[PDB]
Chain A
């Protein structure tokens, strides 16, 4: 009973949130290619990851209730549905939920020119360290769709936040790049998802404090074509982006805290 209450308190809301957990759900149609790509993505997400095994007849753009059911049961705010069809081959649906209700959904398809984690056969990063991110393309900062993609992937692979970082834990970078620039009224370019491992060398030009960085590809290399979009409502956006303000000291005019910790007031 006490363990049950502890689980309930873990499930309940808080001012400073936990790491978002991700649930990988196979659909009614599944393939080995989907299984291998899901395994790679779950290895990138882990250990904030859970995976289903049985098939579920789920259609995100027709109904949301089974997805909300799984989210509320598993305490998972991120969902990845793997499905297949003639119109949507290797279709991965990324779902973000807010308060066990659907916040937003993006639907991507993986192109055939993809390589798994086992293809490269190179040394990879240690389990459970937060990655670096790179986002190539002005549409990530301007366009609504690529803004949604950037926010989703930052939220998905960000992991636990910290104010202190051990430098030895900086190994791998996730790169999301736009396949060429575009203009209005055209097909939307695909997003390329690459994973690199860092190597450092003495530069002899930036001193001993600045090294030369080089990259070695780990995988998976994925090419996402943007199939379908489901944006959140503005009121839902404001509700999801409300900050607590209970934890920070309130700003007071002409009142400061000096280095010694004395509260001081300035007069004029």
Chain B
């Protein structure tokens, strides 16, 4: 995890870094091997948390493409 971009509950929870369902996070995508049209290597993108880590003990997210 690189950063917490937007916790939909509140910007206060965003700045506290709360990871709940629907939170937008920044993830390191280096091992996926993505290249832009200009030849740059992508190593950071956004994802949305899709579960409740307080209930299942882990963070699940879907990449935003």
Chains A and B touch each other in the complex, with CB atoms below 8 Å apart: no
A interface residues with partner B (beta carbon < 8 Å): none
Give chain B's interface residues, CB within 8 Å of chain A: none
